[PDB]
Design a protein around this ligand. Structure first.
Ligand SMILES: *SCCNC(=O)CCNC(=O)[C@H](O)C(C)(C)COP(=O)(O)OP(=O)(O)OC[C@H]1O[C@@H](n2cnc3c(N)ncnc32)[C@H](O)[C@@H]1OP(=O)(O)O
Ligand SMILES: *SCCNC(=O)CCNC(=O)[C@H](O)C(C)(C)COP(=O)(O)OP(=O)(O)OC[C@H]1O[C@@H](n2cnc3c(N)ncnc32)[C@H](O)[C@@H]1OP(=O)(O)O
Ligand SMILES: Nc1ncnc2c1ncn2[C@@H]1O[C@H](COP(=O)(O)OP(=O)(O)O)[C@@H](O)[C@H]1O
Ligand SMILES: Nc1ncnc2c1ncn2[C@@H]1O[C@H](COP(=O)(O)OP(=O)(O)O)[C@@H](O)[C@H]1O
Ligand SMILES: [Mg+2]
Ligand SMILES: [Mg+2]
Lengths: 385, 286, 385, 286
């Protein structure tokens, strides 16, 4: 789960980390009025979408008058914004952040994640602020310093100073940087986060550290113990079907091809899509059928795979599971009916009664092909297109 | 044969629950030596004809079991993977899916420091054909053999199991290490248990996108694996930055793609099969 | 703004009021697992929709097994529920509340609102629990006791005891009832609420008070100072357009007739709808054009009125405003030819340049009728149907 | 003529803002006696040729103004409605829309206890044709006359103004009491100011759904209003339980419908007009 810029800055305020002064706005007027509650110009108005690179897409401008703020809000509320981190569609702008312009002296990068490799939470800092860390990483790796949180002691002040120093700060800028380090680090462990990225962490002309932008990622698995966060999710930024599929214990993801897949198990699911690409086809999605193909569950599974007009065939592939491969065929047929499926369906079963279940499909008299094993089912759907 | 065998005694935690019952009932019938289970507040009763205890210790005393399989809800999993370690159990199998990443992170550290072994969490499974079964898998596609298999995906194993049953071969023992990003034991930990084993002549290693334990296993293979290895990586068609079902099957900031895993798994001296159809066919070449 | 049952019970927990033990659930599995974290059966599973009367619609059942809970969740997640407080459509069930069954001895009613009449926050209690207060009010008004909060002193014990007594409680049941009174009363003032309704407020067999159900209403005007609440709004329960219209400073509401209205000002807006009903027509909506009819604003206004297929004519009616009645006509025309308006449009202007603006519409040649005053514009649209 | 007249001196709070400027500029041209405005932190300057002060007190001293009109954002409105009262202003007009209900609730209590008068909040307006104008309305549809008008809706007033200009009559003075649920002064408070006034021969009372100050006015009319009254209620086609634009135009739990207001406003001895077209026509009958 992801969080908005303004929600992260809000959380930051609670732990005492510094952020500029600003207000989240849902209407032109509200934004407009914010100018004066803030102070004297100028002001920065920012679109609130989950993705980044808003800067280069004209989603963050510095303005100088109350009406320029208004104008901006009317131009974006209710429209989708597309950055280089979204898809052709973009993500809907439903709120504008309007905060005070800060005097920028130098931009740094501060961030953290869970390193699967060394099995620790890790913080990274760099002098290269205002840019994709990934670039700096492959292009000039000796410019990204790191420290790893010990799980026996939690964050410790020296770690914060060590980075502070490799960054070439001195004087009070060190105490400050350590404060921030211990803070984000605390928030990380307390709110069960998966990632943090304050980019850019600025040094004001007046010589102080301040967080200008924040990306927060929370661990979905832990929502049951982070009730406050559970509330902040914004369904409007993610694919509506992804969520619609979860309600039925189905893991869905949309790609862009013409052959749909319905498989049980994530491994076999990715495995299958790969064997369809292998024989010249384009998988149109990944769909893992969770708890056994009951009649209903299979149905909704189709209901979803077929909401995409580009699909021209569907490949089912069930191995094992907790259902006698014959009630599966029973359900598949009944599903093709209730839904009204027009394209070719290629089932592939394996397990119990697998023998007769296949027959029950060849007898059915619909457009259903019982394939003989894996490499066959592949070519058969690839063929029907 | 590794990890377990007909002589391994097992207790199951969260034994009185739905999945706990259903999956034990099976291991009971395949003939695994389940000796009883644990469920706080229900000690002093019987379940599937076995005895139920209040604590993991009360059990390890009265039965002398040495492995525990866990079917407990994520919210409390960390608390029982730990109670296990304390009553000194030496082999822990955790099915549960959805354990908070930071919980595992802490748990793993204890797991090493105390010398205990956990396989999982998140749908793993361990089976030695004919002798033992602890897991959720179907037992009739296996046949006592000479091939060893380690895999992150559970279902992909079933495909590779059947191919090796059908080509005569057979499986020595099957290990599914689980899909989460920080597992209790990874490839290298299981790859070594094979090499040092007689019954296992060759190895099928199954991986997928995300992380780098595939890569690391590679390096460890060129250098310390004498036997032959056939590898398969799932997830080429997979998109960047999205999680494909498994909590740990995601490509983060360009690292951990399908291809690199294949590549670096090749230059290590492994035979890469690009279609999980030719798995059997490739094993024939040994 | 309305809140969910589970969100209220959650707020209750923070102020120490008693509620049963339960967990909010988004998937069959989560609900199913909740059974054991709760305790031994039985359990109550409840649909989480904003409206009430869920009980009589089969949205609240008491069950006895882990699978009956599952079954329930599968049958409702992702579907709309219709009670006697919703419209033909119903409201979408996206979460199930699963909490512990409580031993019921007697059901009371406790509630509060702002009385426009006496200009005070008022609490009401009654022995008639488990039923529409409105009924008890008109049918048996002598069974509803009230007290009014003094704005100089805030809630005070004696008021709590007083109700407590008229309700015929005695012993410790009084201390408890006072605790709850002082609590809800506090939450009311602190969270800027507009209404509270704990129905039923139960007395357990074991002799304790406990809130079994809660309806909370918050004052929209105050969201700027209740950030936590701002986050709990669930857009999925209200008409998507209502919100889509707010983004453009438009107050929209859907009725069910065939003549659309676009008027500036709420009074004239209701007034107009009434004069259309007066001459045999059915107004299809109420739409108040906020900040002067700029070209864009008018457009979106149409875009919305016309998303309803039942419409067969649109009545514009602008009086005064901050725009020269000629640029309004200019905008209306553009609006029509660009949205692609089919039905007949009847403009009615008054103010500056008002009579040349009318001409500019008769010349335009589209299907636009410049009406001569109010009573005309009325009959003209009523006629074109 | 009530509330104000050519001799009423006025200061405006939130004088340097957008709506503050625009609307003052108008009152200044209609010839209203604006004597200066207030904006914290900008005292000691001039705006529309008038003087700007830091506090409402510095103003009331240096100018001797007795009425203040407020154009300040909701979040701070309560604080200045209050500041006015303390510097002893005696007539307060608050335009602001969106003031939290609990804020008004407290504010009203102070407004009575200290004997001050506020009209509003939420788009009200007060104009005595020829003499004075404080509000956002257009001044040329009015003509100095003999009819008084009180209304919750602003725009509905414009309709009734014009009808009475067109039938010769004229308006004595127009009061829009605002749309919020708890206003600073309601019908009865304004109905009385008319009766006791010579320039006003008859009255047009305009209401709408929600609440019950319409009903109460009725009762007070039969009993204490000698002059004649024409009434209009807006919102019959209106649905139950939805707010129609105005914060206080909502039918809550069956109370405050269109019909009852008409009915109870009838049995009181008022002439009800069912179409706001026949407002003029009905006045003709007196
Ligand atoms: S991996 C195959 C495919 N599955 C998936 O992808 C989903 C995997 N499922 C899960 O991860 C679930 O979280 C599991 C753990 C399987 C649980 O599902 P259940 O439906 O079986 O859970 P129940 O609530 O029915 O039963 C759980 C029992 O555990 C007991 N318990 C709680 N706390 C403990 C501790 N600390 N130690 C031991 N047992 C414990 C509960 O009381 C419950 O037993 P009851 O008989 O229900 O009281
Ligand atoms: S009623 C007609 C139709 N209108 C509606 O339906 C909407 C009504 N609009 C509102 O309610 C707005 O909230 C109002 C109050 C009209 C304000 O809109 P503005 O755009 O004019 O607001 P600005 O921010 O431009 O100006 C407000 C000025 O007020 C000053 N101020 C703040 N706090 C105070 C106090 N306590 N006392 C006096 N003045 C105060 C601000 O500093 C600002 O002046 P600047 O010149 O901007 O500094
Ligand atoms: N409050 C601010 N004051 C001054 N400049 C700002 C402010 N917020 C953003 N900027 C400028 O805009 C750039 C992009 O903003 P950022 O919030 O990083 O958006 P994104 O990461 O989506 O591109 C910053 O690198 C900075 O130069
Ligand atoms: N936790 C509970 N324990 C026991 N009975 C309950 C519980 N929650 C609800 N009920 C019963 O269900 C009835 C209806 O529940 P309620 O939450 O009031 O739904 P609604 O107001 O929408 O009809 C209650 O009057 C009560 O009898
Ligand atoms: Mg950035
Ligand atoms: Mg109820």
């Amino acid at each position: 789960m992801n969080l908005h810029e303004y929600q992260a800055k809000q959380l930051f305020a609670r732990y005492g980390l510094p952020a500029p002064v600003g207000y989240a706005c849902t209407t032109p007027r509200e934004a407009e009025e914010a100018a004066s509650k803030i102070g004297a110009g100028p002001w920065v108005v920012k679109c609130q979408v989950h993705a980044g690179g808003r800067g280069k897409a004209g989603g963050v401008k510095v303005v100088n008058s109350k009406e320029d703020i208004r104008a901006f809000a009317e131009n974006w509320l209710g429209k989708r914004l597309v950055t280089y981190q979204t898809d052709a569609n973009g993500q809907p702008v439903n709120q504008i952040l309007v905060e005070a312009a800060t005097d920028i002296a130098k931009e740094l990068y501060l961030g953290a994640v869970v390193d699967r490799s060394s099995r620790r939470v890790v913080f990274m800092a760099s002098t290269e602020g205002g840019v994709e860390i990934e670039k700096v990483a492959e292009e000039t790796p000796h410019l990204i310093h790191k420290v790893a949180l010990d799980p026996l002691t939690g964050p410790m002040p020296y770690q914060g100073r060590e980075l502070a120093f490799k960054l070439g700060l001195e004087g009070k800028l060190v105490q400050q940087f350590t404060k921030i380090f211990m803070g984000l680090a605390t928030i990380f462990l307390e709110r069960d986060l998966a990632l943090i990225e304050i980019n850019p962490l600025v040094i004001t002309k007046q010589g102080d550290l301040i967080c200008l932008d924040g990306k927060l990622g929370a661990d979905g698995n832990a929502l049951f113990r982070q009730p406050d966060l559970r509330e902040m999710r914004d369904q409007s930024q993610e694919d509506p079907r992804e969520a619609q599929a979860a309600q039925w214990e189905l893991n869905y993801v949309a790609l862009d091809g013409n052959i749909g897949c319905m498989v049980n198990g994530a491994g076999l699911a990715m495995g299958t899509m790969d064997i369809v690409k292998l024989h010249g086809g384009e998988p149109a999605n990944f769909l893992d059928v969770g708890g056994g193909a009951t009649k209903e569950r299979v149905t909704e599974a189709f209901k979803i795979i077929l909401s995409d007009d580009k699909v021209k065939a569907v490949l089912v592939n069930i191995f094992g599971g907790i259902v006698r491969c014959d009630l599966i065929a029973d359900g598949i047929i009944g599903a093709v009916a209730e839904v009204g499926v027009n394209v070719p369906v290629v089932v592939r079963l394996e397990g119990n009664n697998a023998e007769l279940g296949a027959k029950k499909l060849a007898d059915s008299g619909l457009n259903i092909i019982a394939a003989k094993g894996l490499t066959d089912a592949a070519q058969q759907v690839v063929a029907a297109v | 044969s590794i990890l377990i065998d007909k002589n391994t005694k097992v207790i199951c935690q969260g034994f009185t629950g739905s999945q706990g019952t259903f999956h034990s009932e099976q291991a009971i019938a395949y003939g695994t030596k389940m000796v009883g289970g644990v469920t706080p507040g229900k000690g002093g009763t019987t379940h599937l004809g076995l005895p139920v205890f209040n604590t993991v210790r009360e059990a390890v005393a009265a039965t002398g079991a040495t492995a525990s399989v866990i079917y407990v809800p994520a919210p409390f999993c960390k608390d029982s993977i730990l109670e296990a370690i304390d009553a000194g159990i030496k082999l822990i199998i955790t099915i549960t899916e959805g354990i908070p990443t930071l919980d595992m992170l802490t748990v793993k550290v204890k797991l090493d420091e105390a010398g205990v072994r956990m396989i999982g969490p998140n749908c793993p499974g361990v089976i030695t054909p004919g002798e033992c079964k602890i897991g959720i898998q179907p037992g009739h596609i296996h046949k006592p053999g000479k091939v060893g298999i380690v895999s992150r995906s559970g279902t992909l194993t079933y495909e590779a199991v059947k191919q090796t049953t059908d080509y005569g071969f057979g499986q020595s023992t099957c290990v599914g290490i689980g899909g989460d990003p920080i597992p209790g034991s990874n490839f290298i930990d299981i790859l070594e248990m094979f090499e040092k084993d007689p019954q296992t002549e060759a190895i099928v290693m199954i991986g997928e996108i995300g992380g780098s334990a595939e890569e690391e296993a590679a390096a460890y293979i060129k250098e310390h694996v004498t036997k032959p290895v056939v590898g398969y990586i799932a997830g080429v068609t997979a998109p960047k930055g999205k999680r494909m079902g498994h909590a740990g099957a995601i490509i983060a900031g360009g690292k951990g793609t399908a291809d690199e895993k294949f590549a670096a798994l090749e230059a290590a001296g492994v035979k890469t099969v690009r279609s999980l159809a030719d798995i059997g066919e490739a094993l024939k070449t040994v």
